[PDB]
Design an enzyme around this catalytic site. Structure first.
Site, PDB file in Angstrom:
ATOM      1  N   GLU A 135       0.693  -1.236  -0.053  1.00  6.86           N
ATOM      2  CA  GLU A 135      -0.075  -0.016  -0.188  1.00  6.86           C
ATOM      3  C   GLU A 135       0.816   1.069   0.178  1.00  6.86           C
ATOM      4  O   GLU A 135       0.551   2.306  -0.945  1.00  6.86           O
ATOM      5  CB  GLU A 135      -1.057  -0.113   1.082  1.00  6.86           C
ATOM      6  CG  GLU A 135      -2.126  -0.901   0.987  1.00  6.86           C
ATOM      7  CD  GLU A 135      -3.167  -0.494   0.071  1.00  6.86           C
ATOM      8  OE1 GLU A 135      -4.052  -1.416  -0.163  1.00  6.86           O
ATOM      9  OE2 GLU A 135      -3.097   0.647  -0.581  1.00  6.86           O
ATOM     10  N   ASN A 180      -7.177   8.342  -6.170  1.00  5.73           N
ATOM     11  CA  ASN A 180      -7.858   7.328  -7.075  1.00  5.73           C
ATOM     12  C   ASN A 180      -8.608   7.936  -8.128  1.00  5.73           C
ATOM     13  O   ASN A 180      -8.944   9.217  -8.099  1.00  5.73           O
ATOM     14  CB  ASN A 180      -8.622   6.502  -6.010  1.00  5.73           C
ATOM     15  CG  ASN A 180      -7.970   6.099  -4.954  1.00  5.73           C
ATOM     16  OD1 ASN A 180      -6.717   4.937  -5.026  1.00  5.73           O
ATOM     17  ND2 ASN A 180      -8.074   6.142  -3.679  1.00  5.73           N
ATOM     18  N   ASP A 206     -12.152   7.698  -8.683  1.00  2.00           N
ATOM     19  CA  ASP A 206     -13.288   8.489  -8.286  1.00  2.00           C
ATOM     20  C   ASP A 206     -13.073   9.569  -7.343  1.00  2.00           C
ATOM     21  O   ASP A 206     -14.097   9.981  -6.937  1.00  2.00           O
ATOM     22  CB  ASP A 206     -14.109   7.208  -7.192  1.00  2.00           C
ATOM     23  CG  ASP A 206     -13.362   7.046  -6.122  1.00  2.00           C
ATOM     24  OD1 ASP A 206     -12.056   7.699  -5.648  1.00  2.00           O
ATOM     25  OD2 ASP A 206     -13.864   6.361  -4.781  1.00  2.00           O
ATOM     26  N   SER A 223     -11.149  10.385  -4.585  1.00  4.76           N
ATOM     27  CA  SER A 223     -10.707   9.925  -3.212  1.00  4.76           C
ATOM     28  C   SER A 223      -9.146   9.845  -3.534  1.00  4.76           C
ATOM     29  O   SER A 223      -8.427   9.775  -4.283  1.00  4.76           O
ATOM     30  CB  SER A 223     -11.205   8.589  -2.762  1.00  4.76           C
ATOM     31  OG  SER A 223     -10.831   7.449  -3.368  1.00  4.76           O
ATOM     32  N   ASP A 242      -5.815   7.967  -0.960  1.00  3.36           N
ATOM     33  CA  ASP A 242      -5.458   7.204   0.074  1.00  3.36           C
ATOM     34  C   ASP A 242      -4.349   7.768   1.039  1.00  3.36           C
ATOM     35  O   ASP A 242      -3.385   8.125   0.419  1.00  3.36           O
ATOM     36  CB  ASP A 242      -5.086   5.645  -0.499  1.00  3.36           C
ATOM     37  CG  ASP A 242      -6.148   4.879  -1.133  1.00  3.36           C
ATOM     38  OD1 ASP A 242      -7.435   4.981  -0.772  1.00  3.36           O
ATOM     39  OD2 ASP A 242      -5.866   4.129  -2.145  1.00  3.36           O
ATOM     40  N   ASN A 255      -8.670   5.414   2.797  1.00  4.94           N
ATOM     41  CA  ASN A 255      -9.477   6.162   1.557  1.00  4.94           C
ATOM     42  C   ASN A 255     -10.447   7.098   2.195  1.00  4.94           C
ATOM     43  O   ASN A 255     -11.281   7.059   3.065  1.00  4.94           O
ATOM     44  CB  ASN A 255     -10.210   5.092   0.747  1.00  4.94           C
ATOM     45  CG  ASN A 255     -10.724   5.828  -0.439  1.00  4.94           C
ATOM     46  OD1 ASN A 255     -12.044   5.996  -0.615  1.00  4.94           O
ATOM     47  ND2 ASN A 255      -9.863   5.882  -1.408  1.00  4.94           N
TER      48      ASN A 255
END
Ligand code: T3Y
Ligand code: T3Y
EC number: 3.2.1.17
Length: 129
Positions: free
Chosen positions: A35, A46, A48, A50, A52, A59
């Site tokens: 990650e 990301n 969409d 969002s 991380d 998220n």
């Protein structure tokens, strides 16, 4: 801070993650490797909208507030920036809520892609725990 593997394994064990919701410690360490590369300050955008955040790439759509994410629910009731400190505590506490929610660790894409179903104990072998 960028943790060493065994350093993070000890810290996660100290935070009670070993077998939390049935996920052995190696799962948590492998997740953090893929990650964030063990980097507490990692941030990645990301598709969409969002982002991380942190050691476990929590998220901003469901879990923390970053002010720029559509459909924000902020279920850990925290600014996303607070998940970026050198200590893993805030990330762990939020992760414990996430992993308890019904989907387990499948919330973490890098965990699904790289860790799930593998010999995750490799990630804690040789570490003083
Ligand atoms: O040396 S390290 O790279 O490991 C380090 C990590 C963290 C740090 O915040 C610090 C150093 C700075 C720091 C230094 C000192 S000193 O001993 O006086 O030099 C003390 C502190 C501190 O933050 C205060 C502190 C102490 C302790 S304890 O000695 O273990 O009880 C824990 C913490 C502290 O803030 C919380 C903490 C936990 C963790 S964990 O690995 O996630 O458990 C990482 C870091 C933390 O600050 C994040
Ligand atoms: O996890 S770390 O990357 O920080 C690490 C630190 C040290 C290490 O020596 C090792 C890893 C390798 C190691 C791992 C293991 S394991 O538990 O099987 O994974 C065992 C050893 C070892 O050197 C051998 C060992 C055993 C014991 S025992 O508790 O008495 O059985 C003590 C030590 C050993 O080396 C001393 C020791 C303790 C520690 S500790 O972090 O203070 O516990 C770190 C390092 C040490 O060499 C210094």
């Amino acid at each position: 801070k960028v943790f060493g593997r065994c350093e993070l394994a000890a810290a996660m064990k100290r935070h009670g993650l070993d077998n939390y919701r049935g996920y052995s410690l190696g799962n948590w360490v492998c997740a953090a490797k893929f990650e964030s590369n063990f980097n507490t300050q990692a941030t990645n955008r990301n598709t969409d909208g969002s982002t991380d955040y942190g050691i476990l790439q929590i998220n901003s759509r469901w879990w923390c507030n970053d002010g720029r994410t559509p459909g924000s629910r902020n279920l850990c009731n925290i600014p996303c920036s607070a998940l970026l400190s050198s200590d893993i505590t805030a990330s762990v506490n939020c992760a414990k809520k996430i992993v308890s929610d019904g989907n387990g660790m499948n919330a973490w894409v890098a965990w699904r892609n790289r860790c799930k179903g593998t010999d995750v104990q490799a990630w804690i072998r040789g570490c003083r725990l």
